[PDB]
């Protein structure tokens, strides 16, 4: 059910796990804990190379938010990044 996402992050190698940190540092450096809202998350996706629609981006960020804050952090972004791939590249 949900383990498919947890297994993807575990299967991902360390070099890939660090890639998310480099992109997230752009907004984490100018933040306290490193949490972004959906309105600013669109810029994070466009900057990383994502083209998700607005009606779909809400679910993309709301479904990964488990704590219920409405803001994607490093942990949530890691689970949202593997879903944005879907197939091979
Ligand atoms: Ca959150």
Angle between helical axes of 74-85 and 14-28 (0-180°, round to 10) = 120
Tell me how far apart the alpha carbons of residues 58 and 63 are, in angstroms, rounded to a whole number: 8
Q: Within a 10 A sphere around the Cβ of 50, how many other Cβ atoms? A: 15
Sign of CA dihedral 76, 78, 79, 82: positive
Q: Which residue has the tokens 């479904």?
A: 63
Alpha carbons 13 and 31: distance in angstroms, whole number: 27
- Residue 78 Cα to ligand 1 midpoint, Å, equals 12
Q: Domain limits of the chain? A: 1-89
> Distance, CA 65 to ligand 1 centroid (Å)?
5
Instruction: Tell how far the Cα of 86 is from the centroid of ligand 1, in angstroms.
Output: 22
Q: Is 67 annotated as a binding residue?
A: yes
Is 53 annotated in a binding site? The answer is: no
> Any known ligand binding at 76?
yes
Ligand 1 centroid distance, CA of 77 (Å): 9
């Amino acid at each position: 059910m949900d383990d498919i996402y947890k297994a993807a992050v575990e299967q991902l190698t360390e070099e890939q796990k660090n890639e998310f940190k480099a992109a997230f540092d752009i907004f984490v450096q100018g933040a306290e804990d490193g949490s972004i809202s959906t309105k600013e998350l669109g810029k994070v996706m466009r900057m990383l190379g994502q083209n998700p629609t607005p009606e779909e981006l809400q679910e993309m960020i709301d479904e990964v938010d488990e704590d219920g804050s409405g803001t994607v952090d490093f942990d949530e972004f890691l689970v949202m990044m593997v879903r944005s791939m879907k197939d091979d590249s």
